Design a protein around this ligand. Structure first.
Ligand SMILES: *[C@@H]1O[C@H](CO[C@@H]2O[C@@H](C)[C@@H](O)[C@@H](O)[C@@H]2O)[C@@H](O[C@@H]2O[C@H](CO)[C@@H](O[C@@H]3O[C@H](CO[C@H]4O[C@H](CO)[C@@H](O)[C@H](O)[C@@H]4O[C@@H]4O[C@H](CO)[C@@H](O[C@@H]5O[C@H](CO)[C@H](O)[C@H](O)[C@H]5O)[C@H](O)[C@H]4NC(C)=O)[C@@H](O)[C@H](O[C@H]4O[C@H](CO)[C@@H](O)[C@H](O)[C@@H]4O)[C@@H]3O)[C@H](O)[C@H]2NC(C)=O)[C@H](O)[C@H]1NC(C)=O
Ligand SMILES: *[C@@H]1O[C@H](CO[C@@H]2O[C@@H](C)[C@@H](O)[C@@H](O)[C@@H]2O)[C@@H](O[C@@H]2O[C@H](CO)[C@@H](O[C@@H]3O[C@H](CO[C@H]4O[C@H](CO[C@H]5O[C@H](CO)[C@@H](O)[C@H](O)[C@@H]5O)[C@@H](O)[C@H](O)[C@@H]4O)[C@@H](O)[C@H](O[C@H]4O[C@H](CO)[C@@H](O)[C@H](O)[C@@H]4O[C@@H]4O[C@H](CO)[C@@H](O)[C@H](O)[C@H]4NC(C)=O)[C@@H]3O)[C@H](O)[C@H]2NC(C)=O)[C@H](O)[C@H]1NC(C)=O
Ligand SMILES: *[C@@H]1O[C@H](CO)[C@@H](O[C@@H]2O[C@H](CO)[C@@H](O[C@@H]3O[C@H](CO[C@H]4O[C@H](CO[C@H]5O[C@H](CO)[C@@H](O)[C@H](O)[C@@H]5O)[C@@H](O)[C@H](O)[C@@H]4O)[C@@H](O)[C@H](O[C@H]4O[C@H](CO)[C@@H](O)[C@H](O[C@H]5O[C@H](CO)[C@@H](O)[C@H](O)[C@@H]5O)[C@@H]4O)[C@@H]3O)[C@H](O)[C@H]2NC(C)=O)[C@H](O)[C@H]1NC(C)=O
Ligand SMILES: *[C@@H]1O[C@H](CO)[C@@H](O[C@@H]2O[C@H](CO)[C@@H](O[C@@H]3O[C@H](CO[C@H]4O[C@H](CO[C@H]5O[C@H](CO)[C@@H](O)[C@H](O)[C@@H]5O)[C@@H](O)[C@H](O[C@H]5O[C@H](CO)[C@@H](O)[C@H](O)[C@@H]5O)[C@@H]4O)[C@@H](O)[C@H](O[C@H]4O[C@H](CO)[C@@H](O)[C@H](O)[C@@H]4O)[C@@H]3O)[C@H](O)[C@H]2NC(C)=O)[C@H](O)[C@H]1NC(C)=O
Ligand SMILES: *[C@@H]1O[C@H](CO)[C@@H](O[C@@H]2O[C@H](CO)[C@@H](O[C@@H]3O[C@H](CO[C@H]4O[C@H](CO[C@H]5O[C@H](CO)[C@@H](O)[C@H](O)[C@@H]5O)[C@@H](O)[C@H](O)[C@@H]4O)[C@@H](O)[C@H](O[C@H]4O[C@H](CO)[C@@H](O)[C@H](O)[C@@H]4O)[C@@H]3O)[C@H](O)[C@H]2NC(C)=O)[C@H](O)[C@H]1NC(C)=O
Ligand SMILES: *[C@@H]1O[C@H](CO[C@@H]2O[C@@H](C)[C@@H](O)[C@@H](O)[C@@H]2O)[C@@H](O[C@@H]2O[C@H](CO)[C@@H](O[C@@H]3O[C@H](CO[C@H]4O[C@H](CO)[C@@H](O)[C@H](O)[C@@H]4O)[C@@H](O)[C@H](O)[C@@H]3O)[C@H](O)[C@H]2NC(C)=O)[C@H](O)[C@H]1NC(C)=O
Ligand SMILES: *[C@@H]1O[C@H](CO)[C@@H](O[C@@H]2O[C@H](CO)[C@@H](O[C@@H]3O[C@H](CO)[C@@H](O)[C@H](O)[C@@H]3O)[C@H](O)[C@H]2NC(C)=O)[C@H](O)[C@H]1NC(C)=O
Ligand SMILES: *[C@@H]1O[C@H](CO)[C@@H](O[C@@H]2O[C@H](CO)[C@@H](O)[C@H](O)[C@H]2NC(C)=O)[C@H](O)[C@H]1NC(C)=O
Ligand SMILES: *[C@@H]1O[C@H](CO)[C@@H](O)[C@H](O)[C@H]1NC(C)=O
Ligand SMILES: *[C@@H]1O[C@H](CO)[C@@H](O)[C@H](O)[C@H]1NC(C)=O
Ligand SMILES: *[C@@H]1O[C@H](CO)[C@@H](O)[C@H](O)[C@H]1NC(C)=O
Lengths: 134, 213, 106, 252, 226, 134
């Protein structure tokens, strides 16, 4: 459980400790640490540190437009379409690893993302027009 | 002094003692913050309560208190045989100094009546050179803090020889005192043998030694 | 008891350490003279407004003979000297048997 | 706490620093270790001494094509007489600076011993003479004339120094690659403020008295220390935890 | 957590004017305020005036603002958080009513609700404003009676405290001591205990010295054999 | 108070203006500003700009998993352990600079961080399982 401890465990047990996975990835790699410094290792270190933040910030930009700036688990007001999966409540959470589930939505994973921005943020932050001051 | 004190308050071991103080509206207890200090007479002082009820860092949480529209006080819970010393207090606003009290000499009874190890110290060969007549004695751990001045020259108490001195509270949280003498050398040589008189509540076993030998 | 812990982002604390710095110089010579060996051909220009704030009640212990700012300065100027000399005329066919005589002093 | 330092210029000098910074008071004395005489000593001038160096030689650029494009710029025949390079120093202004230094060294160094100012004993001609790049060419003015004065226990004449010019150099003892300095055609003058001094040991005197510090600038890093004695960088940590009765909503 | 120590033991005539000092150590001297108090022959000690080592804005007592005034110089930083400084005070007029012991103390905290009140106290200074002249104490041995508890004797000394009474500082653990006494003449005296196990006289030493300021000390008398 | 104005002031006064300190650090340094650009200054500029964001994002990743995505001051539901400090409420806040406090918890500062992720986020975002829809 020190890192990816529940990679093979159930999606429910993996959902119990998903903080750990998030903590190590951005921070990890110990990047922090003749006269030249133009060596082949330093240039592989810098670009490896650039995608470090540019893959982190690629994901953190998505949660910000979903109301999840500082939450590891948002429940979003987007209804689930039956075409994406036909399995019941306890059918997936007590049976599949997150690995199996990632390939089962990888086909229509982009369709979900586009709809998440519309109802949870594009409309929700607008619904306060009549409720902010009245 | 414009501040008040609960004066002499007593107490017992393992129990509580409260000392109150109230003042006039100029430097009173209403809307003016307060504070309480420990003060061994002659020795270095300490601090106990800050502003109101918040006690000192380090001071055990045994010390309670509060503040009403005039009454200000200090509830010292679970007394231990170190608390026997005079306490004080002072009121202050934000940008002003402290206006101290008067003095509550607190004594904690319920103690064990201790018997002091007392012995008399007579003059030596150096006191006869100056001819100054003096003879003293040592008492320690003679609770309570009561004293009785008496001597015996010619089997009768001296009228001009007794020198009453101030008793002190020993650093072991007990008591200590000594009695001196101011007489002429002729009266020393005129009256040889001597006796020590210490009125101590108990059995009559007091040490007694002569000055000529 | 009954005290909780609270987080503060923006706290002023620091620890002694050293990292990389950079040059800063405004418009100096540019056209009338250029190709400077120190300011290179272009460095990060400094702002005319000086960034300064007076710290009060603070007494941080400095060090000069153990300071690493002079170390990065020492090594920066060295790598800068060589960088401004690598693209210039080499003088290797100047090592040939020289036949000289003293100058004309009458 | 400043974000940008002050105008720091990389004066490549030896024994005597030029154009340095200083902010009043007695001529400051700095040493990594005052008791150890072996360690170097940085000295700062409460006021600078205006010095002028120059070469009187009137040279000419002789370009000769070596290979395809490259051209070797050498000295032609010197026109209009030949003279030796020199650096002037204000004689009256220097006697006051050597006096202010010995005064503040006094309470620093016993204030009972004898001052013995001598030329840079030992060393190399480039590390013992006031070596510096000025006007293109590299001067090496003879220091030995300045420190001849000895002061102890209680229109105008100016001292000058003989100097020679060198075209082949590889400074800070870098033996990797050397460089040729093209002679700057025409006139040359330097005219810089001197603001610092670099002084080194005075032998292994066993107790007794009598000692000072003769000039040596064996290290180039110390030259930059005369400007960075007050600067230090720190790693800011914006995170800080502290307790206080204080909690957010119970369930969320 | 910062120890404060006073000068101590200065005394002069009634119409004189003396200054007392206080050595600080172990706390930042810049913001912690300094104040002073005094206990008289009367029962109640009273507060004087509080000084701020920064800015110098002070509010002394109204009854002493006319005569007593106090200042304080800057500090020398030891580290970033520890430093050592000094605080002085000058008093112009005084009488027998102004005699007694004087203390200084560190300011409580460096904030708002309350700062002016003391915190850590020094060992204190006692001042005698008695017009009688200073005198040199006299030394006597004080021998035990039943030798066939130890100490030494002091008789007739004019003012203040004679303090430490032991030779070479050989024994600091288990050395009970004793306070002073007022004589009918007005010339003080005192004695001192020392609790050490009973042993032979030839094996160990029986020498004690006392320090003085009324007059300097020199002799550390010892005890008579019998 | 333009920057670090209360570095030497009380933790309370420093807590009154801690916005300022936060604003300048990420933005600061004016990073924004022969034919080559391979000089020794440009390479020291780029890596100095990389740790700029990779030390900022090293800290901002911690506040996100503490419910403090966009707050400078969160009060967290983690109880304070007496072993970390024995000083009372007004004993530290009216007496110590933040400098002194940083060395007084630097020993057990990591122990706090690990516990902050568990109660304020690892459990709190889970406590909505029975409260989100019911
Ligand atoms: C670090 O460096 C700083 C210096 O930084 C400064 O920054 C700015 C501000 C400029 O001044 C710069 O030039 C400086 O560089 C040093 O900072 C100083 O520390 C001193 C010691 O801590 C402090 O000295 C004295 O503080 C006393 C206490 O303050 C009052 O008020 C505050 C704020 O309200 C409060 O928090 C206090 O506990 C205390 O109590 C309050 O008093 C007010 C006023 O009476 C009450 O208000 C009343 O409220 C009711 C309604 O409720 C009603 O309206 C009444 O009418 C109203 O009066 C209030 O109820 C009280 N309770 C509270 C809220 O707690 C001051 O009393 C004392 O004042 C003296 O100096 C003042 C400033 O010149 C004068 O105006 C005044 O007349 C006195 O002469 C001192 O200020 C300094 O103030 C403080 N800063 C300054 C200004 O220098 C610092 O020492 C140094 N070290 C540290 C600690 O890091
Ligand atoms: C530092 O060192 C440099 C380098 O000098 C080097 O060594 C010298 C010896 C010479 O060989 C250089 O070529 C060599 O690099 C010095 O620079 C040289 O200084 C010398 C000093 O003598 C100069 O020599 C004089 O040159 C005069 C002109 O000759 C030039 O052109 C020649 C061909 O041109 C022909 O036609 C022109 C007219 O259009 C005639 O004027 C010329 O004579 C030719 O007929 C070419 O070959 C030369 O290299 C040069 O470029 C020349 O007139 C002088 O010779 C005269 O007069 C001298 C006194 O001034 C006297 O000492 C000589 O003996 C000589 O007398 C006779 O002249 C006859 C004329 O026909 C001749 O036929 C006889 O042979 C001759 N007698 C004999 C025998 O010698 C000089 O020779 C030289 O020009 C400088 N460099 C150049 C530009 O080449 C530099 O000065 C030194 N430093 C300093 C500041 O001292
Ligand atoms: C410590 O600090 C001190 C501070 O004093 C530093 O010392 C010296 O400080 C001086 C301050 O003025 C600096 O002086 C400058 O000198 C340059 C020299 O450049 C000349 O030569 C260049 C190349 O030669 C060409 O031209 C010459 C003819 O001159 C010819 O013979 C050659 O064959 C070749 O063709 C030229 O490019 C350059 O133009 C100039 O001729 C000089 O350029 C500076 O000019 C200022 O002052 C002059 C004289 O008063 C004035 O005419 C200038 O006016 C404007 O017009 C001119 C002509 O068109 C133009 O070049 C300028 O750009 C202006 O538009 C201008 O005001 C100046 O004189 C000195 O460099 C500096 N260093 C030295 C040598 O010590 C000291 O360096 C510091 N520490 C140490 C020891 O390093
Ligand atoms: C940077 O510049 C400095 C400038 O000082 C230069 O230092 C030079 O260092 C060199 C080598 O170290 C010195 O070289 C030699 O010094 C010889 C010493 O003098 C002998 O003869 C004396 C008579 O000379 C007269 O002038 C001298 C000064 O040189 C003066 O002290 C004398 O009083 C006298 O007037 C003789 O007196 C002296 O010793 C006796 O007297 C002294 C003083 O009273 C006494 O203390 C002794 O007990 C003893 O009784 C000694 O015996 C010098 O002789 C020699 O050459 C001289 O003569 C030749 C030939 O004529 C001249 O051409 C030459 O100019 C000299 O006059 C030679 O000079 C040199 O003296 C230092 N300084 C200079 C230049 O004079 C540095 O080396 C330079 N740095 C670099 C990079 O090179
Ligand atoms: C700036 O840096 C300098 C660096 O020198 C600091 O300067 C300090 O100066 C003092 C001056 O007294 C030195 O004191 C002595 O240094 C001796 C050096 O040891 C040498 O010899 C050792 C043994 O070699 C043989 O000779 C010695 C001679 O004493 C014989 O005793 C021995 O039997 C041998 O026959 C070698 O092992 C060593 O490598 C050296 O070659 C010390 O030996 C000497 O020790 C004495 O004092 C000690 C401390 O009280 C004591 O414990 C020993 O028993 C002995 O009595 C003594 O230290 C400092 O050494 C020197 N510092 C350093 C780093 O060496 C200077 O302090 C600093 N700046 C400041 C703070 O001003
Ligand atoms: C922060 O914590 C460190 C180290 O503590 C560790 O980390 C914490 C989080 C806990 O997990 C601890 O259990 C860890 O051990 C403290 O460091 C201490 O520093 C001091 C001073 O440098 C060290 O003291 C040493 O003392 C040596 C001499 O020992 C003497 O006493 C022993 C025991 O009786 C005796 O056997 C011996 O003969 C000596 O008489 C001395 O040689 C050495 O140079 C040094 O002075 C101490 O050892 C360190 N801690 C420990 C326990 O190792 C910090 O002080 C602490 N800071 C704060 C603010 O809390
Ligand atoms: C350094 O040397 C150069 C070159 O010798 C000097 O330049 C020369 O200066 C003189 C000053 O009058 C110029 O004037 C005259 O030129 C005519 C025609 O050539 C000549 O017949 C005169 O005798 C006189 O020289 C001269 O043109 C000029 N250049 C040359 C080619 O000599 C310069 O003056 C010297 N030093 C400096 C900087 O003053
Ligand atoms: C050189 O030393 C003398 C005396 O050795 C200094 O004069 C003062 O002497 C007294 C007593 O020795 C010291 O307490 C002073 O500190 C000395 N003065 C100072 C201010 O240091 C003399 O001052 C010393 N040299 C100089 C000019 O500073
Ligand atoms: C030229 O100078 C050198 C310098 O060593 C000298 O040896 C040589 O004799 C000199 N020649 C003439 C003739 O001047
Ligand atoms: C340097 O030159 C200037 C030119 O005005 C002159 O005033 C100054 O005295 C000179 N200084 C020396 C001693 O070289
Ligand atoms: C003050 O600290 C003590 C421990 O030293 C603690 O028991 C007490 O609860 C604290 N005060 C408050 C306000 O709780």
């Amino acid at each position: 459980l020190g890192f990816l401890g529940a990679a093979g465990s159930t999606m429910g047990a993996a959902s119990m400790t998903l903080t750990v996975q998030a903590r190590n990835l951005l921070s990890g790699i110990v990047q922090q640490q003749h006269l030249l410094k133009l060596t082949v290792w330093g240039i592989k270190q810098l670009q490896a540190r650039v995608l470090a933040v540019e893959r982190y910030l690629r994901d953190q930009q998505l949660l910000g437009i979903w109301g999840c700036s500082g939450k590891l688990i948002c429940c979003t007001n987007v209804p689930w379409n039956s075409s994406w999966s036909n399995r019941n409540l306890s059918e997936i959470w007590d049976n599949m690893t997150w690995l199996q589930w990632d390939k089962e939505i990888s086909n229509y994973t982009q369709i979900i993302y586009g709809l998440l921005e519309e109802s949870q943020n594009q409309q929700e932050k607008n619904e306060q027009d009549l409720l902010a001051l009245d | 002094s414009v501040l008040t004190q609960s004066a002499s308050v007593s107490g017992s071991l393992g129990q509580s003692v409260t000392i109150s103080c109230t003042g006039p509206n100029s430097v009173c207890c209403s809307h003016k913050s307060i504070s309480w200090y420990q003060w061994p007479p002659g020795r270095a002082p300490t601090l106990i309560i800050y502003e109101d009820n918040e006690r000192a860092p380090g001071i055990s949480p045994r010390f309670s208190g509060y503040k009403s529209y005039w009454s200000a006080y200090l509830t010292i819970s679970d007394l231990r045989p170190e608390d026997e010393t005079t306490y004080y207090c002072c009121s202050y606003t934000h940008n002003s100094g402290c206006v101290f009290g008067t003095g509550t000499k607190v004594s904690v009874l319920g103690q064990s009546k201790a018997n002091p190890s007392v012995t008399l110290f007579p003059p030596s060969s150096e006191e006869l050179q100056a001819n100054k007549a003096t003879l003293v004695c040592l008492i320690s751990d003679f609770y309570p803090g009561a004293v009785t001045v008496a001597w015996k020259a010619d089997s009768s108490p001296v009228k001009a020889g007794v020198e009453t001195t101030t008793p002190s509270k020993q650093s072991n949280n007990k008591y200590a005192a000594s009695s001196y003498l101011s007489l002429t050398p002729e009266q020393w040589k005129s009256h040889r043998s001597y006796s020590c008189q210490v009125t101590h509540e108990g059995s009559t076993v007091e040490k007694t030694v002569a000055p000529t030998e | 008891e009954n005290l909780w812990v609270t987080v503060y982002y923006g706290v002023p604390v620091w620890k002694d350490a050293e990292t990389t710095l950079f040059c800063a110089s405004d418009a100096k010579a540019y056209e009338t003279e250029k190709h400077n060996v120190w300011a290179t051909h272009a460095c990060v220009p400094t702002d005319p407004n000086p960034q300064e704030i007076h710290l009060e009640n603070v007494t941080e212990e400095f060090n000069m003979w153990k300071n690493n700012m002079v170390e990065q300065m020492h090594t920066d100027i060295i790598s800068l000297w060589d960088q401004s000399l690598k693209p210039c005329v080499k003088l290797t066919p100047l090592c040939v048997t020289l036949q000289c005589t003293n100058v004309t002093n009458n | 706490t400043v974000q940008c330092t002050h105008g720091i210029k990389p004066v490549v000098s030896t024994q005597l620093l030029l154009n340095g910074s200083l902010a009043e008071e007695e001529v400051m004395i700095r040493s990594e270790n005052i008791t150890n005489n072996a360690k170097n000593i940085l000295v700062q001038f409460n006021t600078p001494v205006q010095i002028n160096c120059t070469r009187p030689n009137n040279n000419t650029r002789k370009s000769i094509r070596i290979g395809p494009g490259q051209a070797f710029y050498a000295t032609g025949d010197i026109i209009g007489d030949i003279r030796q390079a020199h650096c002037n120093v204000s004689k009256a202004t220097w006697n006051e600076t050597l006096g202010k230094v010995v005064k503040q060294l006094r309470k620093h160094f016993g204030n009972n011993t004898i001052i013995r100012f001598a030329n840079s004993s030992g060393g190399d001609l480039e590390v013992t003479t006031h070596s510096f790049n000025c006007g293109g060419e590299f001067f090496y003015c003879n220091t030995s004339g300045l420190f001849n004065s000895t002061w102890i226990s209680n229109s105008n004449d100016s001292i000058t120094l003989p100097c020679r010019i060198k075209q082949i150099i590889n400074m800070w003892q870098r033996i990797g690659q050397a460089m040729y300095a093209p002679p700057i055609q025409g006139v040359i003058r330097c005219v810089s403020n001197i603001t610092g001094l670099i002084l080194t040991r005075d032998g292994g005197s066993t107790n007794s008295t009598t000692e000072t510090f003769r000039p040596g600038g064996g290290d180039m890093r110390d030259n930059w220390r005369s400007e960075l004695y007050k600067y230090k960088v720190v790693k800011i940590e914006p995170l800080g935890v502290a307790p206080t009765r204080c909690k957010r909503r119970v369930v969320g | 957590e910062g120890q404060l120590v006073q000068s101590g033991a200065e005394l002069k005539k009634p119409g004189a004017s003396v200054k007392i000092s206080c050595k600080t150590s172990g706390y930042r001297f810049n913001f912690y305020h300094i104040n002073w108090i005094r206990q008289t022959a009367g029962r109640g000690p009273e507060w004087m005036g509080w000084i701020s080592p920064y800015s110098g804005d002070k509010n002394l007592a109204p009854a002493f603002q006319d005569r007593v005034i106090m200042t304080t110089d800057t500090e020398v930083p030891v580290t970033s958080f520890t430093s050592t400084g000094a605080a002085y005070m000058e008093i112009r007029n005084l009488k027998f009513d102004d005699t007694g012991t004087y203390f200084c103390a560190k300011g409580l905290l460096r904030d708002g609700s309350s700062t002016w009140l003391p915190y850590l106290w020094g060992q204190g200074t006692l001042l005698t404003v008695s017009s009688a002249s200073t005198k040199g104490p006299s030394v006597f041995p004080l021998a035990p009676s039943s030798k066939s508890a130890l100490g030494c004797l002091v008789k007739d000394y004019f003012p203040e405290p004679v303090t430490v009474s032991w030779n070479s500082g050989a024994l600091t653990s288990g050395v009970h001591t004793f306070p002073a006494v007022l004589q009918s003449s007005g010339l003080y005296s005192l004695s001192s205990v020392v609790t050490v196990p009973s042993s032979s006289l030839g094996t160990q030493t029986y020498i004690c010295n006392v320090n003085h300021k009324p007059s300097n000390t020199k002799v550390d008398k010892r005890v008579e054999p019998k």
